[PDB]
């Protein structure tokens, strides 16, 4: 297959404005949300139909209980961090865990935490240790590393359980996740040449401009890959035209194993 990933995020907010949840957790497969939970609903709900259709109620009920427990733990952890930073007001705590099954069959696994949107603790599952960014993280790192079994548990979950969940969800949503919608590509004039792709799935795409055959990395302006709203994506890349010498410019697009070239005559 192509490369696929499974990730779970958590957001916690210490003093949220009225209405905004104290806690949120969302799962993703590649760019697709699959599941969601927050402190206002107190329920785990599917965010993809093929999750809803393949997981019995006993599954949603079980992780609803687990999530309510994780919410309280997250609150406790945020409380301790903001005491140790000696910080007033509202602050955020985030977590991300997940794994990747690469096309070559190899795997990766990650777990990390952030405070106020900045790296805080990063797990290394090969050295079984935590990287701390400052001395508040270092205090937390000492306590987490004293419990060697919990580290071993995370290694097992990242290398074996997460990969097995990913394969199970990849099968559930295969009509979505494993399909290919080729890009529609054109060149417009605006002075600069704009190479525009749209209508493509998956979102991973490489677009670049060549000049006479050689690439021109420092001269290219790359736009972002953007959701169209219908399950496909669009992107662009521009290059600034030289008015004093003619050059052969060509746009190069690579998507899902297929390369395209649009020569600008």
């Amino acid at each position, epitope marked *: 297959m192509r490369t696929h990933s499974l990730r779970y995020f958590r957001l916690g907010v210490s003093d949220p404005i009225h209405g905004v949840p104290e806690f949120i957790s969302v799962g993703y497969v590649d760019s697709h949300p699959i599941t969601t939970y927050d402190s206002v609903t107190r329920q785990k709900e599917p965010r993809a139909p093929w999750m809803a259709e393949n997981l019995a109620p006993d*599954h949603w009920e*079980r992780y609803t209980q687990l999530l309510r427990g994780w919410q309280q733990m997250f609150k406790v952890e945020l409380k301790r961090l903001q005491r140790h930073y000696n910080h007033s007001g509202s602050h955020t705590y985030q977590r991300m865990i997940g794994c990747e099954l690469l096309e070559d069959g190899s795997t990766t696994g990650f777990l990390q935490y952030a405070y106020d949107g900045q790296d805080f603790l990063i797990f290394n599952k090969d050295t079984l240790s935590w990287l701390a960014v400052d001395n508040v993280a270092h205090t937390i790192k000492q306590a987490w590393e004293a419990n060697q079994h919990e580290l071993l548990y995370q290694k097992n979950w990242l290398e074996e359980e997460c990969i*097995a969940w990913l394969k199970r969800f990849l099968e559930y949503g295969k009509d979505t996740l494993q399909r290919t919608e080729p890009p529609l590509v054109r060149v417009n004039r605006k002075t600069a040449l704009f190479c525009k792709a749209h209508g493509f799935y998956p979102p991973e795409i490489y677009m670049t401009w060549m000049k006479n055959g050689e690439e021109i990395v420092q001269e290219i302006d790359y736009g972002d890959i953007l959701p169209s709203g219908d399950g496909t994506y669009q992107a662009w890349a521009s290059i600034e035209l030289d008015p004093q010498s003619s050059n052969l410019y060509s746009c190069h697009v690579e998507h899902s194993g297929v390369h395209m070239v649009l020569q600008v005559p």
Partner: antibody, heavy 108, light 116 residues
Framework: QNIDQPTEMTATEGAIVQINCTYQTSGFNGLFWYQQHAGEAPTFLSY??LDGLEEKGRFSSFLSRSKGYSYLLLKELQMKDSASYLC??????????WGAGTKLIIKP | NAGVTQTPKFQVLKTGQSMTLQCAQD?????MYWYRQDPGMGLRLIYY???????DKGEVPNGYNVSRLNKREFSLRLESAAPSQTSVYFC??????????????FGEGSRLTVLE
């Protein structure tokens, strides 16, 4: 899902006994051993989640994830080791499945 | 420093009678559990409480109910005792749940015999 251990084992004081635990589960988040003296509460002995052997005094615990089996190894057996030994496995949803327990009888 | 305290140690009941088993833990744990233990089989979860303010059924919930009264206490109610609820009941607690590493701490056990 199921977990299996022998009903009962008998060894002699001073010897070595290996108590087996095989499990069939969807997903695996760890294997626990607990000691339960007759009429008393189970208490935590050991936890394995990666492959291999971990020692803890006279007791060692072994795990092979690919075989789905673990053993609890008790050396230099004493009469106070007479007890039930309970194996328990955390499945993919962090739910414990308990073996029925092995009663260890020690001959003085 | 008490650990898990559950009561009563022994109880006899007539079929149809009600009973509440008490459990408290002074360890500041978040997760609490009620098990039954019977000859020839592994511990079976009756109900559990992953955290204060939430509870849910286990493997064998029928004929029982629970109340997570606060962080410390988790009571098991038998509302209409039946002879099949003759068993030894164990309350347990753990620091958290949905962590893989944390062990359970068990109470002393409650021995219940239900008679016609």
């Amino acid at each position: 899902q199921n977990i299996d251990q022998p009903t009962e084992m008998t060894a002699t004081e001073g010897a070595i006994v290996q108590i087996n635990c095989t499990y069939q589960t969807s997903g695996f988040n760890g294997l626990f051993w607990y000691q339960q003296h007759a009429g008393e509460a189970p208490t935590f002995l050991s936890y394995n989640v990666l492959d291999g052997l971990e020692e803890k005094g006279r007791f060692s615990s072994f795990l092979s994830r690919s075989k789905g089996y673990s053993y609890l190894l008790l050396k230099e057996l004493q009469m106070k080791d007479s007890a039930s030994y309970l194996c328990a496995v955390k499945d993919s949803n962090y739910q414990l499945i308990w073996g029925a327990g092995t009663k260890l009888i020690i001959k003085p | 420093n008490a650990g898990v305290t559950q009561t009563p140690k022994f109880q006899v009941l007539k079929t149809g009678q009600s009973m509440t088993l008490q459990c408290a833990q002074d360890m500041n744990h978040n997760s609490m559990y009620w098990y039954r233990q019977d000859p020839g089989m592994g511990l079976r979860l009756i109900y559990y409480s992953a955290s204060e303010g939430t509870t849910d059924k286990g493997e064998v919930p029928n004929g029982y109910n629970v109340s997570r009264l606060n962080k410390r206490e988790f009571s098991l109610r038998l509302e209409s005792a039946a002879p099949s609820q003759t068993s030894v009941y164990f309350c347990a607690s753990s620091v958290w749940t949905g962590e893989g590493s944390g062990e359970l701490f068990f109470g002393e056990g409650s021995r219940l015999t239900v008679l016609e």
